[PDB]
Amino acid sequence: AKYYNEPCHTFNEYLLIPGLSTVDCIPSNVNLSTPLVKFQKGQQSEINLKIPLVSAIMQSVSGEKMAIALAREGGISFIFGSQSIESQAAMVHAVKNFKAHNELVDSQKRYLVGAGINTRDFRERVPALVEAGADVLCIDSSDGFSEWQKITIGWIREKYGDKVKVGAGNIVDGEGFRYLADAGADFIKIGIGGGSREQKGIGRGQATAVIDVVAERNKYFEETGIYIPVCSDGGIVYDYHMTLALAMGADFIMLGRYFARFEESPTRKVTINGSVMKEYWGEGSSRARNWEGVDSYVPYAGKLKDNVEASLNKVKSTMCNCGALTIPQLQSKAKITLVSSVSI
Amino acid sequence: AKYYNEPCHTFNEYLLIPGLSTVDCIPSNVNLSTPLVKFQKGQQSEINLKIPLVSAIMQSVSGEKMAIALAREGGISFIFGSQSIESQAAMVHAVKNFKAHNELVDSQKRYLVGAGINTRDFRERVPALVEAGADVLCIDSSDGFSEWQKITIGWIREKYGDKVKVGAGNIVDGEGFRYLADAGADFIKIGIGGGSREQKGIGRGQATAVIDVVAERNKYFEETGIYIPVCSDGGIVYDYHMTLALAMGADFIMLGRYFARFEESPTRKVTINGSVMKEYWGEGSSRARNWEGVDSYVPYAGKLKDNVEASLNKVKSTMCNCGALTIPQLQSKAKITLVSSVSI
Amino acid sequence: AKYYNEPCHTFNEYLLIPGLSTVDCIPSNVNLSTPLVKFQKGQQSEINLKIPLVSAIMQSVSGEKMAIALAREGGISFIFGSQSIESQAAMVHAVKNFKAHNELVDSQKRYLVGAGINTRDFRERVPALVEAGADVLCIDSSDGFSEWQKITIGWIREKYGDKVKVGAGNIVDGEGFRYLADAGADFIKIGIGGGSREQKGIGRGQATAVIDVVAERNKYFEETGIYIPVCSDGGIVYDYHMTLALAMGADFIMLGRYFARFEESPTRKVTINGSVMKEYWGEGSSRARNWEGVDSYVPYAGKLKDNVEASLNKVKSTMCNCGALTIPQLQSKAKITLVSSVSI
Amino acid sequence: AKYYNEPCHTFNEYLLIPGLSTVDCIPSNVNLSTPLVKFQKGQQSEINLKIPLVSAIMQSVSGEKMAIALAREGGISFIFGSQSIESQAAMVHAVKNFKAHNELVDSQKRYLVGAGINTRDFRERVPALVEAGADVLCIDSSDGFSEWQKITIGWIREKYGDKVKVGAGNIVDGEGFRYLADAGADFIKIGIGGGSREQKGIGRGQATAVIDVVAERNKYFEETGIYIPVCSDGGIVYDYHMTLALAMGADFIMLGRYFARFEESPTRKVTINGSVMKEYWGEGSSRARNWEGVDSYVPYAGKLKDNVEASLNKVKSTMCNCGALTIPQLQSKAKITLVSSVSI
Numbered sequence A, B, C, D: 001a002k003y004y005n006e007p008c009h010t011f012n013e014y015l016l017i018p019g020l021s022t023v024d025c026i027p028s029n030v031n032l033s034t035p036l037v038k039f040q041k042g043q044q045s046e047i048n049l050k051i052p053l054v055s056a057i058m059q060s061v062s063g064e065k066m067a068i069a070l071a072r073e074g075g076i077s078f079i080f081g082s083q084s085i086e087s088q089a090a091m092v093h094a095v096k097n098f099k100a101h102n103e104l105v106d107s108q109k110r111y112l113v114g115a116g117i118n119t120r121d122f123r124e125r126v127p128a129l130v131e132a133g134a135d136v137l138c139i140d141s142s143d144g145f146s147e148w149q150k151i152t153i154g155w156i157r158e159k160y161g162d163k164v165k166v167g168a169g170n171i172v173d174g175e176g177f178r179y180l181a182d183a184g185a186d187f188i189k190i191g192i193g194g195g196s197r198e199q200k201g202i203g204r205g206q207a208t209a210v211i212d213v214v215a216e217r218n219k220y221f222e223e224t225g226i227y228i229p230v231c232s233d234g235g236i237v238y239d240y241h242m243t244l245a246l247a248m249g250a251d252f253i254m255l256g257r258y259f260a261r262f263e264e265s266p267t268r269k270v271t272i273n274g275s276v277m278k279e280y281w282g283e284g285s286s287r288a289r290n291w292e293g294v295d296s297y298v299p300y301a302g303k304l305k306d307n308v309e310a311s312l313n314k315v316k317s318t319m320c321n322c323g324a325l326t327i328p329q330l331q332s333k334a335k336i337t338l339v340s341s342v343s344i
């Protein structure tokens, strides 16, 4: 077997050491724009998020209202694919035709929206999603280091060329990244065993996963001239974990629990002895996938807007402490230290 | 004294990083066959388990019903030797004559069964066990790095040559493995201070023990052409620990607590305030060895079959995530990372 | 991004290994004097504390009574600047005119006192503080690696030259130290995420911060001939942490919680079911800064004098165990070992 | 300051890996004899304990009955010196004249006994102790790396030459050992911050302390031909810690809590709601030193004999697992591994 020189680590094991903060770095001047899909050196991504946050491909988080609410703030949602092709396409269509400063929209001023797909019924689901107006797709899987994903991306390329964007994942190392990059993925999702590994035994600390995949992505860019955006998926407990994920190289972040707490999540608001909660279950739980996970409750946080703006104001503030006015500048200037077990 | 460069680790400190999963790796195509006794390069083992699980040499787990139930699933039990020679031989005989797709049987279609022996009364116990039809024997001891075991194996060779198979142990390092290999053991058992060390002070994290013994076993194979199967004994808390043990090099796994929970274990089923439990005590407890351990209760799990098949389906699934269709392929392709203290 | 070879550590992870204790090292012969402001090689600091303790720039700790009580023992307080320029100046004036063996005083026998300033209204606050008689100033900020601080120090130099002393901070690495040193700081404060980091994600274990800044300060001294005193600010839970901070290179220590417990702190004494407590809130809490922190209670300790003398007697005693009669000798002879996670 | 490459560790962080156990290593054949005082290469120590255990120099453990009871088993007690010279001498005399297979006695068949002394009134205490018949003395101090101890040993040599044996300590590193060795100590005691460091901040994990001091002691032996026995003092929680301490190089072990639990300890037996306890307080507690420590209760264990024999049977058993029939052989053959934080 193959072993590693160092153990893997989670976001909770890191802290950022401040860099020079210039008089021009104030939160309001921080640009949180970020590329969503791959492009060649020298060019810009065809799709850029206004904020580096995307909602998880889950029944309990990415519904119509979520997609609309997040797009309004500059991010994008990936309508869950764990439902009929007709239902998902309908949700996508509803978001695209809803309108009939930081909002994420297309050339027709319609909100952007994503849609998750699986490596099984894509020959029928994809066309339906494209026709419905889906701006981007993403293969939804825990272990994306699979030939099934290569086959799915290949089919999409054969039928649509590079006109249909498709993210792939999840992977946690350079080999997995490399495989999906060569297969043609527009963006690669990072993360196995991090979300809200102690059942199947597969996974890797999210921080180590991001750091290693990013190094491979950069190596890949230097070899091919192709920059593939990567997504840190899961493992984000606190707002500062967002800044860490971005500083370590992730272009954007996918979150489930974070968004499930909002009024716009498609789950029922339930009051548990004085506390308003919201339902939240994984796609691997028996409660789903029947149209690897648990079924629980998250504290109600109110509307997405206020929470997202508060979280991002914190990120912007921290970025200025690190002397960065943009995500790429943060990824370049960030000083990241591991913290001792005892300190935690 | 002799010290080591790194501290030892337990199974709980590791995770598997996925490898390429091909379209042909589906759980139903995973072969869990594994060698039980030593053979030379180029040949096959005279005895191959259908599944890599064997029940512990304990009064509270390996009785007749257990031996039969496990053999039916492809594994083998080692009837405890902590009883009279006549009683143990009778149990062995009963299993061999019980019948008067994955079942483990001999050329006469009789279920395979093992029997534990000690380094004291073997001159009388062994012949009785051989006559009773025992398919394989195993010296039952915590510290197998002993001249007493060399003497026992030597006596068996002198009287039966290589016609009677005998496992030895336990050891936790290359030196101990080497000593039992040269003594003639057919398979070497790994593990001291792991089962369900804080009393005598001897032992080693199971993971480190397996990894180090396996490296020595491989070195030994390259030097002599003799492949000696090794058994990871104890320290398995969760199903994924099985996959880890196998990925690290163990050919098969010995378990006590895991099997004690089943209806077929020879212990009394007791109800403790709404919970059906089963008795489970170590061979080192005063409750035994009078014909180093504790006496407790384990939650009732039902019949062996359903539990074993569920556990192995998980192992098979994980093996496919690692791109392996067989145990040897898993041992070759597995990517194993240590996890930080804080992550746990 | 930039990463580090080792994780950071806190004071709790260290212990001092005794050195040779000579017959002349008795507690009463230990000199705790220490430089407060920078000087060139070969000279003495214009301001030397009698004891290496200074009270934090906080509303809940450094008021008039505190400043007087601490100065009487040989230390100095930094009257909080989170109040009107007129109020702070009045407090400073009151301390300077209060008197109208180890007391810290000026040539006119008046108690020494410090005052915190911010990088915003200093053009008006500073002159008022100088006129009021403030002996030293200190820019109060969490992230002192800022151009705003360079600008503030520069303004002070342009108007007062080196006649007005001003400390700066906080920083946690060599780069931050270097930046404030070149900007002209008279002393640099160390510490971010240590006080009584899990919200913004910035910081560093106090021990690592002190050790690294001190090495840079020493390197800086060798290159320029300028010795800049450094202050370990926050992260001191137990008395022995003081000895550690000093042994690691800090010239003096800034504390908040420690002094807030005293009768002389400006907070209300409140009895909570049999226990007399005192209020203590951070400057980052909403409870302040409205003229990043929590609002709590600390156990009443009585008058500053008895507590400070008890704490320092312990430090002196430990210094003798290390064979040191002075802080510089301690910094030179101290043997400091990290302790394992498990030992704690 | 001086730092170290690795953090220090405690006994709880180690385990012994078995070595070859020969047919001749049975517990009853294990020799636990060990040297108490220094000798030159090629010779034997003038005083050899029958068992490697000595009771602590404490008011709550080493009284007359303890000294007699331990000597009967082969060990020796050090009558506490924290009492009047007349009282201590009387206790020593009482043990020497008490009798007016493994017992530790002199040429006149009288039980051996030790006595603690301080670096203050030794000019009067020592002569009284020698006249009373004390077989060995030991300077009782937490930080023995002191000129006061050198002065005390020097005075003893000047007046008695090498006819009066005196142990010194405590130290935790090679430098401290070296200093007391050159000063003339007959045996050096190891241990600061281990007994039943979080107050003064000085100390070192007991295991690291023993390992480092032993390496220096061996280096010293090779340079001078003088073998100085070392004593692991404190930090022993479980019986197996004894085996570890000996395996790491300690010739003998000093214990307080362990012996305080016995009927023969000089403390009052008190019943606390169904549990018979015994008082146990440190020499640094206010409860003493008035003729750094806590005052507590330890569970009653009964008479010393049965407990000591049970503890040593375990040590002997473990020694055989390591292939050792004697302590020196154990120190030579022991395989000691550090254990991960998580494993504990």
Ligand SMILES: NC(=O)c1ccc[n+]([C@@H]2O[C@H](COP(=O)([O-])OP(=O)(O)OC[C@@H]3O[C@H](n4cnc5c(N)ncnc54)[C@H](O)[C@@H]3O)[C@@H](O)[C@H]2O)c1
Pocket (backbone or CB within 6 Å): A057, A118, A119, A120, A140, A141, A142, A143, A148, A170, A191, A192, A193, A194, A282, A283, A284, A292, A293, B026
């Ligand atoms: N990130 C994690 O750690 C994690 C863990 C568990 C579950 N999940 C989530 O649960 C949901 C399902 O994930 P998943 O990976 O278990 O589902 P998946 O569809 O990606 O799983 C594919 C695996 O390959 C098999 N297979 C056999 N033939 C196949 C074919 N023709 N095409 C594709 N696969 C074939 C099975 O489908 C098996 O599920 C997702 O939302 C995923 O994110 C995530």
Ligand SMILES: NC(=O)c1ccc[n+]([C@@H]2O[C@H](COP(=O)([O-])OP(=O)(O)OC[C@@H]3O[C@H](n4cnc5c(N)ncnc54)[C@H](O)[C@@H]3O)[C@@H](O)[C@H]2O)c1
Pocket (backbone or CB within 6 Å): B057, B118, B119, B120, B140, B141, B142, B143, B148, B170, B191, B192, B193, B194, B282, B283, B284, B292, B293, D026
């Ligand atoms: N794996 C562990 O960590 C662990 C720990 C404690 C107990 N156990 C279990 O307890 C049971 C007993 O194990 P054990 O090792 O204590 O028993 P064992 O029979 O292997 O022990 C042999 C040891 O050598 C001695 N000895 C002296 N003469 C001997 C002779 N002629 N032949 C053999 N030994 C001689 C004693 O028997 C002593 O018990 C086993 O089932 C074992 O698995 C396991």
Ligand SMILES: NC(=O)c1ccc[n+]([C@@H]2O[C@H](COP(=O)([O-])OP(=O)(O)OC[C@@H]3O[C@H](n4cnc5c(N)ncnc54)[C@H](O)[C@@H]3O)[C@@H](O)[C@H]2O)c1
Pocket (backbone or CB within 6 Å): A026, C057, C118, C119, C120, C140, C141, C142, C143, C148, C170, C191, C192, C193, C194, C282, C283, C284, C292, C293
């Ligand atoms: N040490 C720590 O870890 C920590 C953490 C949080 C808060 N605090 C305390 O809270 C109090 C406030 O600290 P702070 O650093 O948040 O306040 P600060 O005044 O030092 O913060 C300056 C930051 O730059 C911005 N800025 C924009 N224009 C500016 C200008 N012209 N001049 C200066 N800054 C400008 C904002 O003021 C922003 O607060 C202090 O007492 C500080 O010690 C300490």
Ligand SMILES: NC(=O)c1ccc[n+]([C@@H]2O[C@H](COP(=O)([O-])OP(=O)(O)OC[C@@H]3O[C@H](n4cnc5c(N)ncnc54)[C@H](O)[C@@H]3O)[C@@H](O)[C@H]2O)c1
Pocket (backbone or CB within 6 Å): C026, D057, D118, D119, D120, D140, D141, D142, D143, D148, D170, D191, D192, D193, D194, D282, D283, D284, D292, D293
């Ligand atoms: N091992 C530990 O970690 C630890 C910690 C605290 C206390 N203790 C115990 O408490 C008891 C007292 O230990 P201690 O070291 O505090 O006492 P000690 O007598 O060894 O201490 C000597 C120190 O030097 C000073 N000194 C000044 N003049 C002196 C002189 N002329 N001679 C000697 N010392 C002079 C003081 O006495 C001061 O106590 C002992 O039993 C000791 O084992 C042990």
Ligand SMILES: O=c1[nH]c(=O)c2[nH+]cn([C@@H]3O[C@H](COP(=O)(O)O)[C@@H](O)[C@H]3O)c2[nH]1
Pocket (backbone or CB within 6 Å): A056, A057, A058, A191, A193, A194, A195, A196, A197, A233, A234, A235, A236, A254, A255, A256, A257, A258, A281, A282, A283, A284, A285, A292, A293, A294
């Ligand atoms: O172990 C898992 N069991 C599940 O049932 C499950 N469902 C989703 N996911 C994955 O978790 C991400 C969301 O994580 P957070 O809630 O931590 O943001 C998601 O974006 C997915 O990557 C699962 N992981």
Ligand SMILES: O=c1[nH]c(=O)c2[nH+]cn([C@@H]3O[C@H](COP(=O)(O)O)[C@@H](O)[C@H]3O)c2[nH]1
Pocket (backbone or CB within 6 Å): B056, B057, B058, B191, B193, B194, B195, B196, B197, B233, B234, B235, B236, B254, B255, B256, B257, B258, B281, B282, B283, B284, B285, B292, B293, B294
């Ligand atoms: O410390 C011990 N004290 C005992 O009394 C004892 N009895 C058995 N064994 C050993 O433990 C293995 C079973 O472990 P699990 O329950 O963890 O599967 C078994 O297979 C044995 O190796 C003991 N170990």
Ligand SMILES: O=c1[nH]c(=O)c2[nH+]cn([C@@H]3O[C@H](COP(=O)(O)O)[C@@H](O)[C@H]3O)c2[nH]1
Pocket (backbone or CB within 6 Å): C056, C057, C058, C191, C193, C194, C195, C196, C197, C233, C234, C235, C236, C254, C255, C256, C257, C258, C281, C282, C283, C284, C285, C292, C293, C294
């Ligand atoms: O995280 C923080 N939030 C706050 O609100 C805050 N207020 C003060 N400080 C800083 O803490 C130091 C005092 O710490 P102690 O109480 O630990 O001595 C002080 O000297 C400051 O450096 C803060 N840090």
Ligand SMILES: O=c1[nH]c(=O)c2[nH+]cn([C@@H]3O[C@H](COP(=O)(O)O)[C@@H](O)[C@H]3O)c2[nH]1
Pocket (backbone or CB within 6 Å): D056, D057, D058, D191, D193, D194, D195, D196, D197, D233, D234, D235, D236, D254, D255, D256, D257, D258, D281, D282, D283, D284, D285, D292, D293, D294
């Ligand atoms: O920190 C301490 N405060 C005290 O008051 C104290 N009194 C004794 N000792 C030392 O501890 C040893 C006994 O330890 P155990 O109870 O762990 O065997 C003893 O042998 C001494 O080395 C003290 N250490």
Ligand SMILES: [K+]
Pocket (backbone or CB within 6 Å): A018, A019, A020, A021, A320, A321, A322, A323, C143, C144, C145, C146
């Ligand atoms: K900064």
Ligand SMILES: [K+]
Pocket (backbone or CB within 6 Å): A143, A144, A145, A146, B018, B019, B020, B021, B320, B321, B322, B323
């Ligand atoms: K895979």
Ligand SMILES: [K+]
Pocket (backbone or CB within 6 Å): C018, C019, C020, C021, C320, C321, C322, C323, D143, D144, D145, D146
């Ligand atoms: K000393």
Ligand SMILES: [K+]
Pocket (backbone or CB within 6 Å): B143, B144, B145, B146, D018, D019, D020, D021, D320, D321, D322, D323
């Ligand atoms: K052995």
